[PDB]
Amino acid sequence: TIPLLQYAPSSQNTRVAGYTVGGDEQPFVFTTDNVISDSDFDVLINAAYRQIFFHAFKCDRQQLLESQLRNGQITVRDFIRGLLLSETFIDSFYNKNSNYRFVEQCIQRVLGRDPFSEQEKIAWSIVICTKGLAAFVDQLLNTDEYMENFGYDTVPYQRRRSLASREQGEIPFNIKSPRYDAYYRSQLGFPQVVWQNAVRRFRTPDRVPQAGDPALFLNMARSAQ
Amino acid sequence: MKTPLTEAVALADSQGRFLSNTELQYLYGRLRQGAFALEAAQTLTAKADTLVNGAAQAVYSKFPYTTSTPGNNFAADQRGKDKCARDIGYYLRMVTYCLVAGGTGPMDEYLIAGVDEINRTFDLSPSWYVEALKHIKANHGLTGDAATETNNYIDYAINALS
Amino acid sequence: MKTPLTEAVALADSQGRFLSNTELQYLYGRLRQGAFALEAAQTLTAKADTLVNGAAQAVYSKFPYTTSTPGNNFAADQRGKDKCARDIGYYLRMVTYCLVAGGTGPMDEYLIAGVDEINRTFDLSPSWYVEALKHIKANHGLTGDAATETNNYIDYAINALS
Amino acid sequence: MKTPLTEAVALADSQGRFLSNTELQYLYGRLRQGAFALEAAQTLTAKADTLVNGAAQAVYSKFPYTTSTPGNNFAADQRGKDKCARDIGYYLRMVTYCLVAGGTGPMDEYLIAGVDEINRTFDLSPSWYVEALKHIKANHGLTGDAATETNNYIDYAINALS
Amino acid sequence: MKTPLTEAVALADSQGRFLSNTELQYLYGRLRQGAFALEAAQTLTAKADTLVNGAAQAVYSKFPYTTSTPGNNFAADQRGKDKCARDIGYYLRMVTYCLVAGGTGPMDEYLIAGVDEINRTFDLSPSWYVEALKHIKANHGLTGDAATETNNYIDYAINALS
Amino acid sequence: MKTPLTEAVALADSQGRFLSNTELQYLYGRLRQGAFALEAAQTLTAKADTLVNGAAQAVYSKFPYTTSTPGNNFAADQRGKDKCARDIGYYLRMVTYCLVAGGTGPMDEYLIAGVDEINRTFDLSPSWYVEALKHIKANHGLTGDAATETNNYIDYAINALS
Amino acid sequence: MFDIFTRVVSQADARGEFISSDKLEALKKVVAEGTKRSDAVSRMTNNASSIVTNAARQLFADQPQLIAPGGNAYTNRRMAACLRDMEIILRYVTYATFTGDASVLNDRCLNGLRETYVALGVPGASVAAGVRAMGKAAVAIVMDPAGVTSGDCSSLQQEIELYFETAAKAVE
Amino acid sequence: MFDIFTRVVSQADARGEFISSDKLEALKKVVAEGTKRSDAVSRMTNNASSIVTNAARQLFADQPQLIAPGGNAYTNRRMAACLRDMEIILRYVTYATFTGDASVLNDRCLNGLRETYVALGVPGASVAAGVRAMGKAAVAIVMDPAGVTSGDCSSLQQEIELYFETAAKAVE
Amino acid sequence: MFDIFTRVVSQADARGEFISSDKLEALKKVVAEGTKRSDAVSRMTNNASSIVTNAARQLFADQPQLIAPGGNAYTNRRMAACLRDMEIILRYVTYATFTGDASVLNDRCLNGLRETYVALGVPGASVAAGVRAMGKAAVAIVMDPAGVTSGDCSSLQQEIELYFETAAKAVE
Numbered sequence A: 001t002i003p004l005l006q007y008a009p010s011s012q013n014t015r016v017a018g019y020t021v022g023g024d025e026q027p028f029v030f031t032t033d034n035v036i037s038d039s040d041f042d043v044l045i046n047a048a049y050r051q052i053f054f055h056a057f058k059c060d061r062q063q064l065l066e067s068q069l070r071n072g073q074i075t076v077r078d079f080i081r082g083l084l085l086s087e088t089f090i091d092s093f094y095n096k097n098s099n100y101r102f103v104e105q106c107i108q109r110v111l112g113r114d115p116f117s118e119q120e121k122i123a124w125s126i127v128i129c130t131k132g133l134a135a136f137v138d139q140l141l142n143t144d145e146y147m148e149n150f151g152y153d154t155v156p157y158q159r160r161r162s163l164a165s166r167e168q169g170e171i172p173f174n175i176k177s178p179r180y181d182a183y184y185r186s187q188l189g190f191p192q193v194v195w196q197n198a199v200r201r202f203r204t205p206d207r208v209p210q211a212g213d214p215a216l217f218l219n220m221a222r223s224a225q
Numbered sequence B, C, D, E, F: 001m002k003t004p005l006t007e008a009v010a011l012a013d014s015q016g017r018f019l020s021n022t023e024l025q026y027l028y029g030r031l032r033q034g035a036f037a038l039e040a041a042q043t044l045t046a047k048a049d050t051l052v053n054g055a056a057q058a059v060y061s062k063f064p065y066t067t068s069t070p071g072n073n074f075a076a077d078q079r080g081k082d083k084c085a086r087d088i089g090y091y092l093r094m095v096t097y098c099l100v101a102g103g104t105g106p107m108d109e110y111l112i113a114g115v116d117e118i119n120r121t122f123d124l125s126p127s128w129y130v131e132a133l134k135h136i137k138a139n140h141g142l143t144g145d146a147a148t149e150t151n152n153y154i155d156y157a158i159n160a161l162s
Numbered sequence G, H, I: 001m002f003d004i005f006t007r008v009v010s011q012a013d014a015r016g017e018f019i020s021s022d023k024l025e026a027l028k029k030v031v032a033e034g035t036k037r038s039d040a041v042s043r044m045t046n047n048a049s050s051i052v053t054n055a056a057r058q059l060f061a062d063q064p065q066l067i068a069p070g071g072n073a074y075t076n077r078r079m080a081a082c083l084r085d086m087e088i089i090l091r092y093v094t095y096a097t098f099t100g101d102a103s104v105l106n107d108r109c110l111n112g113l114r115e116t117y118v119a120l121g122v123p124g125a126s127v128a129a130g131v132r133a134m135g136k137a138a139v140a141i142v143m144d145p146a147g148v149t150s151g152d153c154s155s156l157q158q159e160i161e162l163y164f165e166t167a168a169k170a171v172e
């Protein structure tokens, strides 16, 4: 069928080479092949959850993918695919956002980079409505950038967020993009005002005692004999 | 958001296919459900106030250490029992919403997704709400088909809590 | 598997670089820890049996409805109290393992990862093990630095349970 | 950015947990390091000017074709030798920063990440800075614990260059 | 593996389409190249032995500290100069292979991918092979298309080395 | 967007390297192509109007049910035949653009990507445009280099349609 | 992501000469007070859960809308997410007083948090009141002495008040 | 991503009729001068490394801050990254004169580069001076004739000055 | 991935009672010798590059095929990849003596390495000779004492010989 629009790429910290070195701003990398103990599976599963769902609660966790991955038949790439097509991601991210903001969020969380331009999210928003969320996630995983940067056996991360000798590099994309936007919090109607200022009690205004007032000596008379 | 209609739309939507005959059946099968379901929601709305009061009675009679031992979580004083009336009223209202929508999605969205951390951090033993929902499912006195729907309904509530 | 040495190895493996000068300090800082830690593990091994018996005493005195009300979870009969001795002995032994390893990884691997579903499905209120660990951390009587390390230790246990 | 404290924070952030006994162990092990490290940084600051002059002497005596052959990279004239004083002063200052921070992260961030392309495109043979760092590690004269850090320290510099 | 034909096949495979008109033009443009390229490969095969001997002469005359200073990398004794004859013969042979294939792929596959670590770990300054390839470029004597092709060719070699 | 030059640029960009010797070879092979290609584009521009009229004649003579049967797709009345003149003029113009660019990319971008759904939904049998392109490739009377390229050219058109 | 040791390093590098003696007295007394600093952090994270529930319980006693229907923290996962956010802010302020610098706090969590809470519809002043009450309990937990040698932690009481204040003012 | 052949194609398609004769004289003389064009590109990329180091060596002789501490290109990886950027700009201007169109240059590298250098803190005028000096050396290696039969190169000396100028003005 | 502390933990857990006193004497003397252990690791990784080039230079002096054409390490990236593999084996044996256990070595790098070298066509005995010579130099960086306190390192020189031997025998 109809191919994608050709959108020109824009400059970013990713398409550039970069001379990376081992520091902490580099995300700890979680790979299926070397975790081989039972606890390190828990750390990897927690990290993939932190990326895809932002701290999934026990309701959001899928027993089948975690079980099957601890046995080792599942690849972590297939595990991320199963997370994206799972209903808690669809419910939290595909439902509440429009197609364009969903593609923005999904590119950030699968590929680990911001989309290059608005026309890229526009060009990728054809395929999700025409061919389904499964085909969108499948075509996203099959692209060569996800494969060269992470591969089969690596949980993705935000790639080259922070440059050397910077205080800040970049917003971590978990802070930057939450699941609501302004448009759907308007539907939920959340800014109901806290209204705890200027209540205007009607009781009579207190007047400071004038010089020579009897009360002025009340507080010392209470302390005296 | 689990109603049969939105899941039909999500299936057609995920697939990308147009609405079909398979989706259509759900709508007139939602007739087998809804023709009693709206009646049962109304009669639960009538039964509601005595249901929460009896459920509070059953929870206090099952666990006397709640009404005895002083604590923030326990209903020793008045305000704890007010929190209990609030919590069981929330549970009964989510049962009514779950009954009107046709699926567990309102109940699964408004109650179930955070109940594990709330029961962990705030020291609310879920067997209390087990007692409350079991007393409700014994006391509601639904008739025929509507009653059967609630059991599947209220058992899902207990299974999410347990 | 959280010990400081395996985390240094994991950091060096994830970065793909051999251990630096900073990595070396880690182990001679494990000297500030271990020079009391092995002593404290031995004295906990000596204190162990009276610790579990006193913790069972404190849990039964805090919650009399456990020893009163008949149930599978509650310690009404002998075999329930035997399960309690098993559970608190497991908790104390994981504290000793956590103390010898130097990090929370044995305790986090052997206890913490499944405790939420076990407390949900088997009706084990975690405030019971809160009482047990608080009684242990009051009763162990550790001296100096060893006592403080365990306290950060036992507070992590309560924070995982609460 | 490799100091032991920021790596402890990075480990706790990647796992999503709070600190443990290990963080305390890490920093009071940074006592085993820092109680000599700040002394050694001060005495290197005192030794610094004769260190760069002797290192320039050793590099010129090892490789006479630098002072002989006319070129932009070679120190034939004055301005080349000024560039050499700048380069070895930068190396010694990064050693001092690496010593004060406790880990290789300042040195690995300010020197190591681009040295391969700079030595490739600008025709700077790294064996020159090998000579310079070997002369520094022979000439600095730090007794006891300080010497071990430097060898561990300055050997990492040579291993990054070679 | 960069020849124009395999890149046409790789483009058609990645697009999953049948060969286009441009690919067909591609090979009769490989006629503009190859009709001199095979001649130039033969005359380089004839020129080869005096080319390596003159390149060794130029490298030894440019850098006398190689023939003077004793070392494993430096050609002080016989076996070092034998290694030099091997290295420059390898460079000239990769130039001949690169000329016969039509693209840089043999040269980029057999030389370029590891030259940075080999020059880093084994202390081989790449300006030596810069001298060698510049001396080779100067005296081949090829006339016309082959000469122009060689310059683009040998400049790519120097640009990979520098 | 398939011309040989943009595919050379795309290959060099995907490989992240400067344009090589092979890329240079391709454009002077675009000389073997273009030295006849621009001539053939001009003579097709001259031949164009009689080509579309003869192709409409051949399509109407091959399929008389188009000119007979009343329908929106069929050319029963005048406006259908006007649509036919538009469609075959579009096909001939894309052939001319494809000839001038050097690759199938203009034709593959402007015609081929949507032709399957248009022929499916609008009831346009592609064997009609098969007849039209076969009549064009028989009637154009191109010679030498232009003739061979066009057949490769117009056969690609029929292969995309069939 | 900056330790105060590498704060001195990066400032002396942007200057471009060696670390002066006055900064070395300061760093030596940093080393003599970092003992207080590091395990001040861990006693703050000792009762971190009870601190979080007490601050949230006070906040929902002060503002009854947030547990009223229609409020921001009303449904169960939104209330759990609010507890998650308060735990995260406490944990990052704990990291910041462990590094000894507010750079991790302003760098890791605070910066886009202002825009996130505005775009979600989340009230910011409620978070500000929560982090302020949480900070009061935080120093006092660390400040109060149970089974610890008496010492001057005034700087710790000082610097952790600064860190909680930067958190609350950057939430806004 | 546009060849000048498909520039004529896309303009004639947006017009919607065949390519006129005047554009065909122009394209024929493009074909007669593209010989000059393509290998003008490769002789520009012949000494591309020495061009890059000479332009950077001139730039850091003109602005001594960028190798002074506190400057933008001071530390070793930042200096290496600056060399990488200058090589990238030269390589893309080389692609642009190979395509014969500045569309690859404005499309592939220049557009977000302005915002990238502003958001990084990188000076833009220093890059502008670097690309201008690099372009002067570039034609004089393209422009000067060595081993090539002398022939008119006005379009080539001309068009590559235009491409370097668009690069420097779009960096700003 | 196993520290010797959690080796004792996992063995006592599979037993299922507390850690006995004899294992606690052993672990206390482990704590008294782990000082030697950890920075034995770092002095091994002090000259790790020169160790790697010396072992490879000896290996290609012993087997002239591997730099002869047709050999396994002949072309430039294959030779660089062989240096990468020898560095990786040294780094993992360094990790293994830092953990104090060969579990990281047998767990992280050795296991599929045998099948990888067989399926690639890589000789295994050449790697075995390389790791053996590398281990000899490795202890002696550690084994010889220069400008430092004398000690009973015989036990420890011991363990690194065991680790290099397991590496070479598991390559095969």
Ligand SMILES: CCC1=C(C)/C(=C/C2=NC(=C\c3[nH]c(/C=C4\NC(=O)[C@H](C)[C@H]4CC)c(C)c3CCC(=O)O)/C(CCC(=O)O)=C2C)NC1=O
Residues within 6 Å of the ligand: A038, A064, A066, A067, A068, A070, A071
């Ligand atoms: C969709 C179908 C499906 C099944 C059935 C399945 C089983 C399955 N059971 C597992 C473990 C397990 N299975 C058991 C089983 C039992 N305990 C006992 O003592 C009894 C013999 C038995 C209870 C019947 C135990 C104890 C483990 C944990 C072993 C471990 O994780 O170390 C694991 C390893 C992952 C983990 O849970 O840690 C998988 C994948 N996975 C699937 O995807």
Ligand SMILES: CCC1=C(C)/C(=C/C2=NC(=C\c3[nH]c(/C=C4\NC(=O)[C@H](C)[C@H]4CC)c(C)c3CCC(=O)O)/C(CCC(=O)O)=C2C)NC1=O
Residues within 6 Å of the ligand: B059, B066, B072, B073, B074, B075, B080, B081, B083, B084, B085, B087, B088, B090, B091, B110, B111, B118, B122, B124, B128, B132, G057, G060, G067, G074, G075, G076, G079
């Ligand atoms: C709409 C779905 C929904 C659920 C499930 C829910 C549970 C819930 N119950 C709460 C409190 C409570 N719930 C109870 C009720 C009980 N505790 C006991 O010990 C009794 C046995 C039981 C009475 C049946 C009490 C006593 C509190 C008070 C906690 C406190 O004051 O700190 C709170 C803390 C909020 C507050 O401070 O008012 C939540 C979020 N809230 C919801 O909005």
Ligand SMILES: CCC1=C(C)/C(=C/C2=NC(=C\c3[nH]c(/C=C4\NC(=O)[C@H](C)[C@H]4CC)c(C)c3CCC(=O)O)/C(CCC(=O)O)=C2C)NC1=O
Residues within 6 Å of the ligand: C059, C066, C072, C073, C074, C075, C080, C081, C083, C084, C085, C087, C088, C090, C091, C110, C111, C118, C122, C124, C128, C132
């Ligand atoms: C190594 C870490 C570890 C933990 C944490 C653990 C918890 C644990 N406690 C259990 C049972 C139990 N634990 C208790 C203990 C108590 N319940 C109460 O009501 C008392 C207040 C409290 C005494 C302190 C009791 C009574 C059971 C019995 C459940 C039954 O018989 O169905 C069971 C069911 C296994 C069995 O049937 O024997 C598990 C898995 N097991 C472990 O292996």
Ligand SMILES: CCC1=C(C)/C(=C/C2=NC(=C\c3[nH]c(/C=C4\NC(=O)[C@H](C)[C@H]4CC)c(C)c3CCC(=O)O)/C(CCC(=O)O)=C2C)NC1=O
Residues within 6 Å of the ligand: C032, C033, C144, C145, C148, C149, C152, D020, D021, D022, D023, D024, D025, D028, G035, G036, G039, G040, G142, G143, G144, G145, G148, G149, G150, G151, G152, G153, G156
């Ligand atoms: C990671 C495991 C670990 C811990 C927990 C640890 C704590 C620790 N705190 C110490 C001191 C101290 N800790 C405090 C702390 C305080 N005093 C107050 O009155 C304040 C309220 C409070 C700070 C808010 C003080 C005042 C000292 C005095 C000694 C010193 O300056 O270190 C010391 C000095 C050495 C010793 O006590 O034997 C230790 C060991 N050391 C460790 O290795």
Ligand SMILES: CCC1=C(C)/C(=C/C2=NC(=C\c3[nH]c(/C=C4\NC(=O)[C@H](C)[C@H]4CC)c(C)c3CCC(=O)O)/C(CCC(=O)O)=C2C)NC1=O
Residues within 6 Å of the ligand: D059, D066, D072, D073, D074, D075, D080, D081, D083, D084, D085, D087, D088, D090, D091, D110, D111, D118, D122, D124, D128, D132, H057, H060, H067, H074, H075, H076, H079
């Ligand atoms: C903070 C870490 C850091 C490092 C490592 C560094 C290396 C470095 N050394 C340079 C130049 C230089 N470095 C040297 C030094 C030497 N060359 C020789 O032949 C001598 C043997 C040796 C003296 C020891 C010389 C001569 C140049 C001049 C290059 C030129 O003028 O083109 C340049 C070019 C910058 C300029 O033009 O001033 C860099 C980036 N710069 C840094 O900022």
Ligand SMILES: CCC1=C(C)/C(=C/C2=NC(=C\c3[nH]c(/C=C4\NC(=O)[C@H](C)[C@H]4CC)c(C)c3CCC(=O)O)/C(CCC(=O)O)=C2C)NC1=O
Residues within 6 Å of the ligand: E059, E066, E072, E073, E074, E075, E080, E081, E083, E084, E085, E087, E088, E090, E091, E110, E111, E118, E122, E124, E128, E132, I057, I060, I061, I067, I074, I075, I076, I079
């Ligand atoms: C097919 C592509 C290819 C390249 C590029 C290549 C480089 C290469 N040159 C080497 C050695 C060498 N190459 C040289 C050559 C020189 N060194 C100098 O100082 C002179 C200036 C220069 C003479 C021009 C020398 C002296 C060695 C010896 C290193 C040693 O014996 O340790 C080695 C070590 C292998 C061995 O020990 O024989 C490699 C891999 N090998 C290849 O197979």
Ligand SMILES: CCC1=C(C)/C(=C/C2=NC(=C\c3[nH]c(/C=C4\NC(=O)[C@H](C)[C@H]4CC)c(C)c3CCC(=O)O)/C(CCC(=O)O)=C2C)NC1=O
Residues within 6 Å of the ligand: E032, E033, E144, E145, E148, E149, E152, F021, F022, F023, F024, F025, F026, F028, H035, H036, H039, H040, H042, H142, H143, H144, H145, H148, H149, H150, H151, H152, H153, H156, H157
């Ligand atoms: C891709 C590999 C490749 C290259 C590099 C190549 C170049 C190339 N340039 C040529 C001609 C030429 N090239 C130039 C170029 C110039 N003269 C000047 O004075 C100007 C300054 C400069 C342009 C800026 C000229 C003037 C000619 C004359 C012949 C012709 O028109 O082609 C020719 C004609 C045939 C021949 O020389 O044998 C070749 C081969 N051919 C190839 O196959």
Ligand SMILES: CCC1=C(C)/C(=C/C2=NC(=C\c3[nH]c(/C=C4\NC(=O)[C@H](C)[C@H]4CC)c(C)c3CCC(=O)O)/C(CCC(=O)O)=C2C)NC1=O
Residues within 6 Å of the ligand: F059, F066, F072, F073, F074, F075, F080, F081, F083, F084, F085, F087, F088, F090, F091, F110, F111, F118, F122, F124, F128, F132
């Ligand atoms: C640039 C590439 C391009 C192609 C390929 C193209 C095909 C195309 N042909 C169309 C119509 C048509 N094309 C034809 C032509 C024919 N049908 C027959 O039955 C005859 C055998 C044949 C004459 C050769 C007719 C009759 C229609 C009319 C459909 C209608 O009026 O509903 C339409 C509908 C647009 C309209 O309503 O005017 C499209 C999109 N359009 C393009 O822009």
Ligand SMILES: CCC1=C(C)/C(=C/C2=NC(=C\c3[nH]c(/C=C4\NC(=O)[C@H](C)[C@H]4CC)c(C)c3CCC(=O)O)/C(CCC(=O)O)=C2C)NC1=O
Residues within 6 Å of the ligand: A054, A174, A175, A177, A178, A179, A180, G066, G072, G073, G074, G077, G078, G079, G081, G082, G083, G085, G086, G088, G089, G108, G109, G110, G113, G116, G120, G122, G123, G124, G126, G127, G130
């Ligand atoms: C590392 C730093 C970091 C922070 C701080 C952060 C905040 C953050 N808070 C959120 C939600 C939330 N935040 C709150 C906040 C509160 N409830 C109230 O009523 C008060 C006004 C306030 C408590 C202080 C609530 C209720 C939500 C849930 C809104 C929703 O998810 O619909 C969300 C949306 C995702 C979700 O949890 O459902 C993010 C990303 N994320 C980060 O990565």
Ligand SMILES: CCC1=C(C)/C(=C/C2=NC(=C\c3[nH]c(/C=C4\NC(=O)[C@H](C)[C@H]4CC)c(C)c3CCC(=O)O)/C(CCC(=O)O)=C2C)NC1=O
Residues within 6 Å of the ligand: A011, A012, A013, A014, A015, A016, A017, A018, A019, A163, A164, A165, H066, H072, H073, H074, H077, H078, H079, H081, H082, H083, H085, H086, H088, H089, H108, H109, H110, H113, H116, H120, H122, H123, H124, H126, H127, H130
């Ligand atoms: C395809 C087109 C493209 C361009 C142009 C591009 C530029 C680009 N330049 C960068 C940095 C840089 N750019 C410079 C620039 C210079 N140094 C100076 O002093 C001068 C003002 C200027 C030299 C002209 C420096 C020093 C850095 C490193 C800053 C840093 O990484 O901290 C970075 C950050 C990543 C990094 O290299 O660390 C990008 C993405 N990326 C692209 O994808």
Ligand SMILES: CCC1=C(C)/C(=C/C2=NC(=C\c3[nH]c(/C=C4\NC(=O)[C@H](C)[C@H]4CC)c(C)c3CCC(=O)O)/C(CCC(=O)O)=C2C)NC1=O
Residues within 6 Å of the ligand: C021, C024, C025, C028, D032, D033, D145, D148, D149, I035, I036, I039, I040, I142, I143, I144, I145, I149, I150, I151, I152, I153, I156, I157
């Ligand atoms: C990470 C930075 C660091 C290093 C490098 C370090 C080394 C170090 N090695 C030590 C001791 C020692 N180190 C050795 C080592 C050996 N003696 C031999 O004859 C053997 C050949 C060799 C082992 C192969 C010995 C024998 C001692 C005696 C004291 C002790 O047992 O610690 C000590 C004891 C305290 C002191 O010397 O002041 C230090 C500091 N400490 C540090 O904080």
